[PDB]
């Protein structure tokens, strides 16, 4: 029962104080990258996890592999780039206007077909990927080729996770690769904003097997073949919602992998529980551990 994530793996330099990145003085270093965040979540839920990515031959690349190893995420598919350094992004999560500065000339955007460990990806039942990694070549063509290649042997999950800043000057190609990725996906996760934006350009944001649309404060919605199920969010006191989204995706993939048929109700309750609890942990890796979850019936239904 393997779940493989392929994409960006990087260092998040999170602003410690408020203000535009221009005026932030202090930063905290943490591991980041949607695919890596989900990989860690999947692992915490008790499912063997693998990450396919590329870091530089430097201290930060070493740091990320170490942190991933501590979470028991299979790191064999993470290649070290001798020319490009570990990906980094400076982020400001605070304030009404969260912002970021992502360095694109880095290792994870430099993946080529010869970097892919095919044994690992062919061994997975579900392969997860996002749009961020597709923002630049060679990683874009590489990822698309890998997906097209394993289609049929593995369920393909795609988190839209759209970041317009990463496509300035190539919006036409963006629409094309996103649409192509969606059509290749059995599982598609997106926000209503992303659904509107995309559909407002002739692109239908839907998975062939399952679609999950996040509604921010209203919770989320699980759509399958005209059968729609809405799930309001739990009312709790969040300490940090930074990793909620990826905690949700992890849960959703683990649930799909675990339950016989795709029972939207049980899946929704499980996903919801994981996300809700993730808000009680700090950081990008806030997914709760299997243990903390067994105390819940909505979790035993999928993990136990």
For 44, list phi and psi in degrees, rounded to 5.
Answer: -65, -25
Residue 220 binds which entry of a second copy, ligand ANP, none, CB below 5-8 Å type-dependent: ligand ANP
CA-closest candidate to residue 251, choices 195, 303, 190: 303
Residue 118: alpha-carbon gap to chain centroid: 20
CA-closest candidate to residue 283, choices 71, 3, 87: 71
214 assigned ligand-binding residue: yes
Cβ nearer to ligand ANP, comparing 147 with 212: 212
Q: Which of 5, 43, 214, 287 binds ligand ANP (CB under 6 A)?
A: 214
Residues 146-205, interacting with ligand ANP (CB under 6 A): 161, 191
Tokens of 87: 């990906």
Q: Are 106 and 88 in contact (CB under 8 A)?
A: yes
Candidates 85-93, 193-201, 216-224, 280-288; binding stretch for a second copy (CB under 8 A): 85-93
Spatial distance between the Cα atoms of 104 and 241, rounded to a whole number of angstroms: 26
294 binds a second copy (CB under 8 A): no
CB 85 to a second copy: min, Å: 5
129 binds ligand ANP (CB under 6 A): no
CA-closest candidate to residue 256, choices 206, 303, 297, 300: 303
Spatial distance between the Cα atoms of 16 and 92, rounded to a whole number of angstroms: 8
Residue 283 binds which entry of ligand ANP, a second copy, none, CB below 5-8 Å type-dependent: none
Q: Are 117 and 89 in contact (CB under 8 A)?
A: no
Residues 264-303, interacting with ligand ANP (CB under 6 A): 272, 275-276, 279
* CA distance to 5, 128, 132, per residue, from 154 (Å): 12, 10, 21
86 assigned ligand-binding residue: no
Q: Which of 47, 106, 210, 222 binds a second copy (CB under 8 A)?
A: 106
Q: Do you find a cis peptide bond into 239, omega within 30 degrees of 0? A: no
Q: Are 50 and 2 in contact (CB under 8 A)?
A: yes
Q: Which of 186, 233, 240, 262 binds ligand ANP (CB under 6 A)?
A: 233
95 binds ligand ANP (CB under 6 A): no
291 binds a second copy (CB under 8 A): no
217 binds ligand ANP (CB under 6 A): yes
Binding mask 10-49 for a second copy (x = CB under 8 A): ---x--x---xxxxxxxxxx--------------------
Q: Which residues bind a second copy (CB under 8 A)?
A: 13, 16, 20-29, 58-60, 62-63, 66, 84-85, 88, 90, 99, 101, 103-106
């Amino acid at each position: 029962s393997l779940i493989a994530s392929i994409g960006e793996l990087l260092i998040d330099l999170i602003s410690v104080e408020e203000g535009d990145l221009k005026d932030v003085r202090l930063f905290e270093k943490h591991p980041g990258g949607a695919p890596a965040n989900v990989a860690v979540g999947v692992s915490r839920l008790g499912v063997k996890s693998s990450l396919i990515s590329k870091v530089g031959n430097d201290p930060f690349g070493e740091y990320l592999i170490e942190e991933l190893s501590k979470e028991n995420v299979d790191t064999r598919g993470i290649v070290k780039d001798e020319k490009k350094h570990t990906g980094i992004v400076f982020v400001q999560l605070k304030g009404a206007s969260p912002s970021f500065l992502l360095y694109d000339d880095v290792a994870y955007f430099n993946m080529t077909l010869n970097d892919i460990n095919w044994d690992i990806v062919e061994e997975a039942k579900i392969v997860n990927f996002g749009s961020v990694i597709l923002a630049r070549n060679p990683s874009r063509e590489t990822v698309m080729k890998v997906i097209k290649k394993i289609k049929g042997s593995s369920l393909i999950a795609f988190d839209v996770n759209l970041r317009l800043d990463l496509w300035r000057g190539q919006e036409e190609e963006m629409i094309k690769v996103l649409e192509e990725s969606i059509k290749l996906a059995d599982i598609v996760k997106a926000s209503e904003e992303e659904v509107l934006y995309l559909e407002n350009q002739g692109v239908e944001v839907k998975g062939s097997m399952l679609t999950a649309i996040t509604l921010g404060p209203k919770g989320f919605r699980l759509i399958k073949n005209e059968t729609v199920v809405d799930v309001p969010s739990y009312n709790v006191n969040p300490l940090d919602t930074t990793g909620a989204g990826d905690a949700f995706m992890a849960a959703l993939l683990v649930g799909i992998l675990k339950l016989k048929g795709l029972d939207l109700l049980k899946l929704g309750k499980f996903a919801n529980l994981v996300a809700a609890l993730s808000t009680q942990k700090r950081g990008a890796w806030s997914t709760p551990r299997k243990d903390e979850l067994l105390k819940y019936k909505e979790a035993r239904e999928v993990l136990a």
